[PDB]
Structure formats: C-alpha cells, structure tokens
Amino acid sequence: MTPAFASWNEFFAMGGYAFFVWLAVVMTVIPLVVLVVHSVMQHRAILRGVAQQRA
Amino acid sequence: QLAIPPRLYQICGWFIPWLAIASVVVLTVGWIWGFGFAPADYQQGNSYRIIYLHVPAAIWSMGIYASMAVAAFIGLVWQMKMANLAVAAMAPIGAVFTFIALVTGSAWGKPMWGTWWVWDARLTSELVLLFLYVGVIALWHAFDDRRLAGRAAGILVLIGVVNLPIIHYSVEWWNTLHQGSTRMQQSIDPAMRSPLRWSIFGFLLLSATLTLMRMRNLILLMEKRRPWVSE
Amino acid sequence: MGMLEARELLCERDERTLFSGLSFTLNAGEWVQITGSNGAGKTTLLRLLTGLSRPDAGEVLWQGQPLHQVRDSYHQNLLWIGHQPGIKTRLTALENLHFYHRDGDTAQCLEALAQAGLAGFEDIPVNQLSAGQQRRVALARLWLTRATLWILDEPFTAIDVNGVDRLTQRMAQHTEQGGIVILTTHQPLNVAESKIRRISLT
Amino acid sequence: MGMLEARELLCERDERTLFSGLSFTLNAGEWVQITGSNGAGKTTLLRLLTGLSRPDAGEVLWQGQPLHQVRDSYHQNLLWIGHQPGIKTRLTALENLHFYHRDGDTAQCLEALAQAGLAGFEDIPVNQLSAGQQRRVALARLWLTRATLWILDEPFTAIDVNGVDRLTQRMAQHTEQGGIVILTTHQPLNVAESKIRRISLT
Amino acid sequence: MMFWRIFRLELRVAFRHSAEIANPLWFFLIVITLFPLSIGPEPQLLARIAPGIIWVAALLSSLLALERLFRDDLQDGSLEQLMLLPLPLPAVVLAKVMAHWMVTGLPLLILSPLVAMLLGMDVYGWQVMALTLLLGTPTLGFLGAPGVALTVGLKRGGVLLSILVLPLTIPLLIFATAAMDAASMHLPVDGYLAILGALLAGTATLSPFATAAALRISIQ
Amino acid sequence: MMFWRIFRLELRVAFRHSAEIANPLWFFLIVITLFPLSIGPEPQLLARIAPGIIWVAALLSSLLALERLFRDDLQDGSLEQLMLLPLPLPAVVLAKVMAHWMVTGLPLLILSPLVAMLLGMDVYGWQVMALTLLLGTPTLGFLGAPGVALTVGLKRGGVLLSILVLPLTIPLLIFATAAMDAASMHLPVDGYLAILGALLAGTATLSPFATAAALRISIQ
C-alpha cells in the first residue's frame, strides 16, 4: 500500500548508489540462472546420451 | 526406514516441483518486501540494501560447506555410496554462492572504501572458502572411474572442515595485526531483520532445489548401465 | 572354525559384472588356483581377498572376523606377490630382502638368493638386472618368510623352466604342512592336477 | 628407376651391429616380410626406411632420390603404423579418423571402421575401449588411404583370428593395383608363401 | 594438410574433452593471492612488486604446459605428426605451440582485469599490462619450444631446473619487468615495448626452424 | 618390518634418487636470487619483502619435493606396506613423511645462515627463520601427505596437488610471516612460536590417519 520509495525509475533505481546495487543484483541473478539452465540441460543431455547409446 | 534403493530419482521427483514453486514465492517477498519497503540507514544512504544479496550468500556460503561434512561423515564411516555423491552434488552450488558473496562484498566496498579490493576478514574468508570449493571441484572432475572421486572428495572435505576454523581464526587476527579496527558495526536495525530472515529462508529453499535437482542428475551419470534406466 | 572364507563377494567395474555372489571356504593345507575365464584381470578378486580393495558387495572373513577389524595379526600371516615386483629398483638385491626379514639376516638371505639361481648377483643393484631376473628377486622371498597364507599373483611371469620345479617343490612342502597358496597362471602346473582345487569366477 | 633402394645400410645401436650392408631395392607390386628374432633391429630398420632416423652408413633412395631431399611427395604416399597405435587416448575413433582421412568425409570413415570390426563403437573414447580395439582402429586406415607404400610394424599384435583374416584379405587387393607393403610380424602369414618375399635381417 | 585441422585437434584435446585449462588458472589465482597474505594488505607496496609475481607465475604455468606440449605425445603420437602431414615440420610445430598460447596466454589475458584489481593497480597499469602479456607470452613459448627436444628422457622433472630454455627467457623478463616500472612511475613504455614486438618478429620466424631441427635430430 | 627399518630404507633409497632431491633446493636458490632483481635492489624494500618471499619460496620448494613422496613407489613399491608390516598404516605414513622432511626439510634448514648472510638479516634474524623453518616444514609435510596420497591415483598432473595443499597451509604462512615481521624491529618473539608448535602438534596428530585413509582410497 505504501513503498519506501516515492515514484518510478526516476525515484526508483536511482538512490545515489544505483550502479553498485544494480550491478550486484544482476551479477547475483546471472549465476543462479546459469546454474539452473546448466543443470536442466545436463539432465536432458543424459537422457539424450542414453537414447543414442541404444544402438 | 532407511533401505534406499535406486528409487531416489523417483523419490526426489515429487519434491522438485513443490520445493521450487515455493522457492520463488518466498524469495519474491524477501526481495520485494525489501528493495522498496525497507527503510535505509543514515551513513550509507540508499546503499544499505545489498544485505539481502550478500548476507544470505555468505551465511549459506559456509552453511552448505558445514553440511558437506555430514554428507561425507555418513559416507565414510557408514560406507554409504549414495550419500557420498551428495558431496559432489551441492559443491557447484556452494562455489556459486561464495563467488556471489565475494562479488557483492566488492560492490558494497566501493562507496566507502573507494577501491574495489581490500583484504578484509569477512571477505578473505569467503575467498579461501571458494578456493577449497574449487579444489573439491577439481578433485572430483579428475578421476575417470566413479565411486572413487566421491570418496576422495569426502576425505578432502573432512580435512577442510578440520582446518577451516583455524584458517578463519588466523584470518581475523591477521586483519587486526595490520589494519587494527572494524569496518562496520554489528547493527542490523529492528525494522530491517525480518526481510533478512525471509531472504535467508528463500535462499535456503532455493539451494535445496538446486541440490535435489543436481542429485537427480548425478544418480543417472553413475547408474547408466542398468535395466532400471529402461524408462 | 576354519580360516579365510568368502561371503557373497561381488564387484563391478561399471561395465561388466566380474563375479556375482562368490562364496568359498578354505581350511588348512589347500592349494587353490583362480580359474575363472578372464573378463578382466583376476587381480581384482585377489586384491579384494587381501583387503586392499573394499568389496562392492559382501565381505571377506578371516578366522571368523572381517579384515577391517583384525588388521595386525592377519598381515603377519600374509604374503602377496603381484605383477608388480614390489622391490625398490635402486638398491642391491641383498638390501631389498633384508627389509622383509625379521632376524638372523645376512646369514640366510644370501643362501636363499643363491638357490633362487641369482648366485653371483647378490651385491648388485636391481635396476642393472634383467626383467626375468628382477622377478626372481621378488620370488626369492618365499624361502625366508614364515607366512602361513601365500597369495601369488602370476608367479611364473618370466621365470625359466629350471626354477619352476623348485618353486613347485617348495610350495609342494608349504601346502603339505600348513600353507595356503593361491596361484593364478595361464601356463599349467607340472604337478599332478588331482590335488589342486580349481574355482571359477561365478 | 624403381622405388626405395636403401643401399649399404648400417646401424650400430648400443654395442652391437644390428645389420651391415643391407643394400636391397624394392620394385612395384612387392609384398615382403622381415624375418628376425625378438631383439634384432626390427624397429630400427622400419624407422630407417621411413626417414625418421638416419643410418650409421648408407642411405635410403626413394624413386632414385634421397628421402631427405624431396621429403614432400613421400609423406603423402606413405602409411606407417608402429607398435604404438598413434591415436590420442582421449578422443574417440571417429574424429581421429576424420583427422587422418585426407578429405574429411565423415561418411567413408563409417564403413571403414565398420569393416574394421567396431560396429557401434564410433563415439566411445578409445581409452574406454579395449586394448586390441585401439590397434584395430589405428590400423583401420587401410580402406580409406590410397597410399602405395605401407610400412606395417607388428599389425597382428592382439587382434583376433577373424580380424587377421579380414586384414590379410584386404591386404591382398593392394599388391596388384599399385601396392608395395613391408611387414614385421612374429605371426606366420596364412596366405601362400609364393607371393611373399622374405628379407633376412643379416 | 590444413594446419587449421591440426590446430582444431589440439583445441579439441584441451577445450572440449579434457577440461584441464581451468586448473592452471585457479593455480595462478592461488599464486596471486599467496603473496599478499605473506606480505600484508598494505596496498602501495603491492603496486610495485606485482609485475614480478605475475610474470614468474606466468612462466611457471608456461613451463608446466611445455611438458604437455611434447612429453605426453612422445610415447604414442610424435612420428605420425612428422611422417604424415606433408606440410613442412615447422608449420606442424606452430599449430601445436599456437595451442600452447591458447592454453596459457588467453586465460591470463581474460582474467587480467581480475588480477589487476586484487593487487591494486590503476587502469593505466592494466592497459599497458594487456599489451605485454599478449605480446610476451607467445614469444616465451616460441623460444621455449626448441630446447624441449629430448631434454627430459622419461622423468617428469630433472633438467627442467635451468637446462637451456630458461637462460634465454631471462633476457625477455628483463624487459617486461622493467617496462612496468614506467607504468609504476607513470610514463609511456613506448620504446621498451617497441622492441618486444621485434622480439616476437625475431622468434616467430626463426624459432620454428630451430624446433624442426631439434626434433629431427632427436628422432634420429 | 620395523619403524626405524622403514626410516633407514627410505633414507637409503632417497640418496640413490639424486638429481631430483636437490632440485627443490636449486629452485629455492634461483627464486631467492631472482626476487632481488625482480623488484630491484633497495635496502629497506628488500628487508621488508624478504620474510614473505623466503616463505613463498619454501612453499614452492616443498610443493616440488612433495611430488616424489608417493609417485615413485606407486607402480612398484607403494604396496607391501598395506598387506604386510603389521604396524598400523598411520605409523607408515609418519615414517615416510618424517623421512621426507629429513631429505627435504633439513637441507632447506642447513643453508639458512647462507640465506641470512645474503639477504642481510642479523644473527637474531638467522635464529628466527631457523626456528620457524624447524617448526614449519614438518607441518608442510604432514599437510601435503593427504594431498599426495590422493593425487598419486590420478598419476597425471601435479597442479592438482598444489590446489589441494596450498590453501590448507595459509595459517602457517600468516603466523611465520608475522613472526619474522616481529623480528625486524627486534622485539621479543616467543608467542608466535607457541602457536606454530601447537599447529605442528595438531597436524602431526591427525594427518597420518587422514593420509592412511587417503592411501586406502587410492589403492582401491
């Protein structure tokens, strides 16, 4: 109902240290996405390798 | 009660959806009831917010590694091959958490330090923890024959848990020897701790999701020559 | 009540099942050869039997106890000679056998080395000798030890015909008295087959 | 006039003269085997004719010219397989074949390897494969290459009888088109001795 | 034929299958952090010693990879790469040593921004640092390749103490380690860098023939 | 089959393995002679930098020496201790590593007066690095024993061993460098030695069991 900020990206995403906070959040979100995508793609690749082994 | 067959893949398959669908609903509260609802401090302005992206990446930085000893203790004295693979399962998760913690520390240092890197105990400890993590990763991805890489990783992580408190406790004293003071005081603000608790529980819930999902992968990588995988 | 047995031993190399549920009991004075057709090296079973390697399934029982409970008196009653000679190839032949000899040294080692056929090759570094004579140094340990349970892995590797009869005349007394000898060879035994118990990898 | 004409070859490895004055010429459609014992200059002779090493005296004269002089069109029409397979231990057979294949066809290698015998092993790493299959893959470059000079150093190392038969029958069609082949093996060849030349290592 | 496919061969040996190239990287990070712990977090002192440590670590990793250049190949594949491949033997060597840099130089250039901030050098101390570890690392491989030949017969260590390759590397090190002094005191390297490219030009055209002669005599 | 028999045999075979047992000493010498020219000759600067560089050199020398602890006997003589020699395997590890310190730590200790005279440290400085090397190098051996016991199984590497051992030796480096830094202004140093002795006892109390277990891992 009420935020700690005041307005849109002119008030949000710019608090005087915006670059550091946004660099931190992006460099945290990227490794998690990399981990999950690597794990799921490896999961699919193991079944692919099992299927191709069936020959 | 504990007669684990190669059913874990079927066992931790009913857990992944419910443990991950809830892994975002609690994290979307620890990051939105923060980052826009939590008032900031006075000395750092609107920069006292990286806590949620740094402290949970630091508490579970060692919280995973402390769980490694249990995963290796059961896998050595009781000689359980499956649980030993757990040590090889969540290691990348811990390494990523440590790297995230280091990056967030470097980013948080800039407003006050003026430079990217200064050797601090609360940060060099995470650096050396990353170093033990990458050592474990290199050890496991070295043996061509399985059922041995896990056991070597278990003994190595046991040695690491033995030597970790000594290393850390030498680190804060080495920091005091040269610099001689503390940077930030242990003050968390009463109306700033509940968002931190929510973020801690969210990161814990996501780490469990990653470790179970990787456990599903590791079982197949070592049990790929049996009729069980006929499905 | 007898000595070393087997309890549903099973090992896997992750591609083939070498053996499933192996179980055999050995009492005193029995001559054994591992005769199971090579899927892999028979050395794996022998190592599991000696206790260096932990069985994938089952356990090996010595004198009524497993090999991880009693691990001091069992190694006194043990002698393992594999493909690898197990001798430091920088010292002389006399020095290597001296280490494995408990007492009364320098008065029985050289005689054993001489009867082994390396007479005149005592005070000479091992590395300077032939591979057919290097294995002779390892095989010369047979006449000095007092171990009761011999485990020989491919004993007739590079030994000449003149020594094979002496070997299968000293073990011909060891197994008669109290010995437990386990060979694994592709060449056959000139000794009569009616006495040896052949067991196959099943 | 005429292919490799190594004249008065001489070698003095260690303290023994392996061979002296080996001045033998090779004509077209010539299939020959080197007769010797285990310890003679069997490997040195092949490495000296291939130009990898240089003889103590004499020289090897290809097509009437020294090997080391032209050294450009002799590499493209020569196939030398030594005791070692020559294959990287971590790569699988198929990409090694594309490398060694001079067109990078990715298809002809399939039937070439299938005729070798490893049908269904086109993607398993050679280290994960068996030992004899490694030499089989190494020697599999006989249905792809069109080089009219084959130097076969112990081809029949640990391959089965059927593999020996298929390789020997494949060897037969080479001798008449343009093929000139030299072997160094301890296994007597099953084909008739009438088409075999034999060189004694004197 | 097609030195490109040979180059792809060493890349697939290293990159695709044997994910080992990360190992010397983490070791070089070990070395990078090992010194500040022994000396202290005291910043400006680390701003001067840094080139020496980074270059000794780089040469250590390079000499470690020199063993994998040849000795892992000698037992099984070293004559077929010479017997076959009708293109000149020097050109065969280039690709292999061109993999060496791809194993030892490229990771260092990629991680250089990370190291230049751990020790505490300014940006200008990195722009000049980028164009000395890329202009100097390949050259080290070029002049270290010829002496390998058969210097170590079967043993891993032994004559790698100094033998012959290392004494010729020192006159390279006297340049780079003295170039960054100009970076420490903030003047352009200029001439001290202009000769480094000449060193590359003098080792990318004659060293290959030295390697060819050395291996040809060794196999003889 | 005796403890002292094991030690005597290991010493006797150690001497015949020459041309590589002095290689760590030569590496120590070359790095300690390279560093003064790596950074340049300045009295105060060399005095400040010496305590760290001599210990990183000792660490590298021990790392190089540790590769031959269990590598040589792997294919021939790493066996005959587990199946025989009824003495517990931890005792075997203790014998082997203490003999390794005899052949490696002691020669590192014996040239310390030469190193002190070369780098200018006083008699008090000679005493301080002599004592810290006496109590330090055995800890290096005990800490590297599990690492080598693990890495002999791979039998193709060496940088593995480095990553396994080096991060485990950080507190030793910290305390030793702190002790030497306390010796520059000649303030009394006895407290830093007590902690070094405590960690020596700790690593001599638990590492042999861990190394025995690691050998049991590698053999299978």
mmCIF file of N, CA and C in Angstrom, chain C residues 53-92:
data_model
loop_
_atom_site.group_PDB
_atom_site.id
_atom_site.type_symbol
_atom_site.label_atom_id
_atom_site.label_comp_id
_atom_site.label_asym_id
_atom_site.label_seq_id
_atom_site.Cartn_x
_atom_site.Cartn_y
_atom_site.Cartn_z
ATOM 1 N N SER C 53 41.379 -53.563 -1.427
ATOM 2 C CA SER C 53 40.182 -53.030 -2.054
ATOM 3 C C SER C 53 38.945 -53.505 -1.306
ATOM 4 N N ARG C 54 37.990 -52.594 -1.136
ATOM 5 C CA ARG C 54 36.763 -52.898 -0.412
ATOM 6 C C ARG C 54 35.749 -53.516 -1.359
ATOM 7 N N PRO C 55 35.185 -54.676 -1.025
ATOM 8 C CA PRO C 55 34.245 -55.327 -1.946
ATOM 9 C C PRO C 55 33.019 -54.464 -2.195
ATOM 10 N N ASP C 56 32.540 -54.498 -3.440
ATOM 11 C CA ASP C 56 31.328 -53.761 -3.777
ATOM 12 C C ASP C 56 30.110 -54.356 -3.088
ATOM 13 N N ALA C 57 30.082 -55.676 -2.925
ATOM 14 C CA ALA C 57 29.023 -56.348 -2.188
ATOM 15 C C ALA C 57 29.626 -57.535 -1.457
ATOM 16 N N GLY C 58 29.169 -57.761 -0.229
ATOM 17 C CA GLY C 58 29.694 -58.828 0.593
ATOM 18 C C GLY C 58 30.981 -58.439 1.296
ATOM 19 N N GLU C 59 31.508 -59.392 2.060
ATOM 20 C CA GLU C 59 32.712 -59.191 2.850
ATOM 21 C C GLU C 59 33.509 -60.487 2.904
ATOM 22 N N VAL C 60 34.798 -60.354 3.201
ATOM 23 C CA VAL C 60 35.707 -61.486 3.338
ATOM 24 C C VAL C 60 36.018 -61.671 4.818
ATOM 25 N N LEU C 61 35.900 -62.907 5.294
ATOM 26 C CA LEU C 61 36.013 -63.226 6.713
ATOM 27 C C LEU C 61 37.299 -64.013 6.939
ATOM 28 N N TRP C 62 38.149 -63.512 7.831
ATOM 29 C CA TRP C 62 39.397 -64.173 8.194
ATOM 30 C C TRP C 62 39.291 -64.727 9.608
ATOM 31 N N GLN C 63 39.438 -66.048 9.736
ATOM 32 C CA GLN C 63 39.475 -66.726 11.028
ATOM 33 C C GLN C 63 38.212 -66.472 11.843
ATOM 34 N N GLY C 64 37.149 -66.013 11.189
ATOM 35 C CA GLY C 64 35.901 -65.674 11.846
ATOM 36 C C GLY C 64 35.638 -64.187 11.963
ATOM 37 N N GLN C 65 36.604 -63.341 11.606
ATOM 38 C CA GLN C 65 36.432 -61.901 11.691
ATOM 39 C C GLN C 65 36.738 -61.248 10.347
ATOM 40 N N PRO C 66 36.106 -60.111 10.044
ATOM 41 C CA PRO C 66 36.428 -59.397 8.801
ATOM 42 C C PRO C 66 37.829 -58.808 8.832
ATOM 43 N N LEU C 67 38.296 -58.303 7.694
ATOM 44 C CA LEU C 67 39.666 -57.826 7.570
ATOM 45 C C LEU C 67 39.864 -56.402 8.075
ATOM 46 N N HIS C 68 38.790 -55.650 8.321
ATOM 47 C CA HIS C 68 38.940 -54.313 8.880
ATOM 48 C C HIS C 68 38.923 -54.306 10.400
ATOM 49 N N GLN C 69 38.441 -55.379 11.028
ATOM 50 C CA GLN C 69 38.505 -55.492 12.480
ATOM 51 C C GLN C 69 39.896 -55.923 12.925
ATOM 52 N N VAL C 70 40.349 -57.083 12.450
ATOM 53 C CA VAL C 70 41.710 -57.551 12.709
ATOM 54 C C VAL C 70 42.539 -57.165 11.487
ATOM 55 N N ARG C 71 43.524 -56.301 11.712
ATOM 56 C CA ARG C 71 44.408 -55.836 10.656
ATOM 57 C C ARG C 71 45.865 -55.789 11.091
ATOM 58 N N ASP C 72 46.243 -56.552 12.117
ATOM 59 C CA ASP C 72 47.633 -56.651 12.538
ATOM 60 C C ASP C 72 48.175 -58.074 12.566
ATOM 61 N N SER C 73 47.443 -59.029 13.138
ATOM 62 C CA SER C 73 47.889 -60.418 13.147
ATOM 63 C C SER C 73 47.640 -61.124 11.824
ATOM 64 N N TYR C 74 46.697 -60.639 11.022
ATOM 65 C CA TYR C 74 46.427 -61.201 9.706
ATOM 66 C C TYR C 74 47.516 -60.878 8.697
ATOM 67 N N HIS C 75 48.108 -59.687 8.782
ATOM 68 C CA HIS C 75 49.158 -59.319 7.845
ATOM 69 C C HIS C 75 50.468 -60.035 8.131
ATOM 70 N N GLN C 76 50.684 -60.486 9.368
ATOM 71 C CA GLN C 76 51.807 -61.378 9.631
ATOM 72 C C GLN C 76 51.624 -62.703 8.905
ATOM 73 N N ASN C 77 50.393 -63.213 8.867
ATOM 74 C CA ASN C 77 50.074 -64.443 8.148
ATOM 75 C C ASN C 77 49.557 -64.063 6.763
ATOM 76 N N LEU C 78 50.421 -63.414 5.988
ATOM 77 C CA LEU C 78 50.031 -62.972 4.658
ATOM 78 C C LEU C 78 51.281 -62.720 3.829
ATOM 79 N N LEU C 79 51.172 -62.970 2.525
ATOM 80 C CA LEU C 79 52.284 -62.778 1.597
ATOM 81 C C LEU C 79 51.673 -62.604 0.210
ATOM 82 N N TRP C 80 51.762 -61.395 -0.336
ATOM 83 C CA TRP C 80 51.156 -61.080 -1.622
ATOM 84 C C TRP C 80 52.247 -60.678 -2.602
ATOM 85 N N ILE C 81 52.281 -61.342 -3.755
ATOM 86 C CA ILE C 81 53.225 -61.036 -4.826
ATOM 87 C C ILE C 81 52.410 -60.889 -6.103
ATOM 88 N N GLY C 82 52.286 -59.661 -6.595
ATOM 89 C CA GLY C 82 51.522 -59.395 -7.792
ATOM 90 C C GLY C 82 52.389 -59.304 -9.031
ATOM 91 N N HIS C 83 51.796 -58.734 -10.082
ATOM 92 C CA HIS C 83 52.559 -58.433 -11.287
ATOM 93 C C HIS C 83 53.696 -57.472 -10.975
ATOM 94 N N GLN C 84 53.432 -56.491 -10.129
ATOM 95 C CA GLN C 84 54.446 -55.540 -9.704
ATOM 96 C C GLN C 84 55.385 -56.207 -8.704
ATOM 97 N N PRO C 85 56.699 -56.189 -8.946
ATOM 98 C CA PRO C 85 57.616 -56.916 -8.049
ATOM 99 C C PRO C 85 57.564 -56.447 -6.605
ATOM 100 N N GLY C 86 57.344 -55.158 -6.372
ATOM 101 C CA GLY C 86 57.326 -54.637 -5.023
ATOM 102 C C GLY C 86 58.686 -54.473 -4.386
ATOM 103 N N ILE C 87 59.734 -54.300 -5.186
ATOM 104 C CA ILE C 87 61.095 -54.134 -4.691
ATOM 105 C C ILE C 87 61.644 -52.816 -5.220
ATOM 106 N N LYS C 88 62.320 -52.069 -4.349
ATOM 107 C CA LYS C 88 62.898 -50.785 -4.729
ATOM 108 C C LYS C 88 64.052 -51.020 -5.696
ATOM 109 N N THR C 89 63.851 -50.672 -6.963
ATOM 110 C CA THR C 89 64.841 -50.942 -8.007
ATOM 111 C C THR C 89 65.929 -49.872 -8.063
ATOM 112 N N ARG C 90 66.506 -49.565 -6.902
ATOM 113 C CA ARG C 90 67.658 -48.677 -6.825
ATOM 114 C C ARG C 90 68.726 -49.292 -5.932
ATOM 115 N N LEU C 91 68.310 -50.179 -5.035
ATOM 116 C CA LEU C 91 69.232 -50.844 -4.134
ATOM 117 C C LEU C 91 69.669 -52.188 -4.709
ATOM 118 N N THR C 92 70.585 -52.838 -3.998
ATOM 119 C CA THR C 92 71.013 -54.170 -4.385
ATOM 120 C C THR C 92 69.967 -55.204 -3.973
#
